[PDB]
Design a protein around this ligand. Structure first.
Ligand SMILES: NC(=O)[C@H]1CCCN(C(=O)Cc2ccc3c(c2)CCC(=O)N3)C1
Ligand SMILES: [Zn+2]
Length: 140
């Protein structure tokens, strides 16, 4: 589990969104595994605006933050899980690291701020849903 709290937005994995998220919906995209809902309180996270390919992510199944090298956001085939059939996921970045289903939501960050959240796992790989192109998270 986990979310990004930027401005009056909460960014979560679409497959982990709650009823309150769907009832306060700002934007969602199944192909990216992302959903954004509105919040009453302002958050403290800042979004990175860059093309870094190195950063650090939080792994809840290890209680550890790991430094990783990751690919650029791309269209990647992801195997079936209990939330989606096997399909192509867009804006996804891969790295070598540990990721169990419940690790979804952990933040990946670089020197500029939050880059994305854990969205996929298995086979010794971790995949992150990028948020750096969502410029509207910084306003309104
Ligand atoms: N965004 C997505 O499509 C993900 C959301 C739902 C779940 N998805 C995952 O990848 C999560 C995942 C984590 C660990 C494993 C596995 C899956 C299958 C193989 C294995 O041995 N371990 C897919
Ligand atoms: Zn960066």
């Amino acid at each position: 589990s986990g979310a990004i709290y930027v401005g009056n937005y909460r960014v979560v994995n679409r497959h982990l969104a709650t009823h309150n998220d769907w009832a306060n919906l700002v934007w969602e995209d199944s192909s990216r595994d992302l959903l954004v809902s509105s919040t009453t309180a302002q958050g403290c996270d800042t979004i990175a605006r860059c093309d870094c390919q190195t950063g650090v992510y939080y792994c809840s199944s290890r209680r550890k933050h790991y430094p990783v090298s990751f690919s650029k956001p791309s269209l990647i085939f992801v195997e079936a899980s209990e939330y989606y059939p096997a399909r192509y996921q867009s804006h996804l970045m891969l790295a070598v690291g540990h990721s169990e289903p419940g690790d979804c939501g952990g933040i990946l960050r670089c020197q500029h701020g939050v880059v994305g959240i854990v969205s996929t796992g298995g086979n010794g790989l971790v995949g992150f849903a990028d948020v750096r192109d969502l410029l509207w998270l910084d306003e309104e």
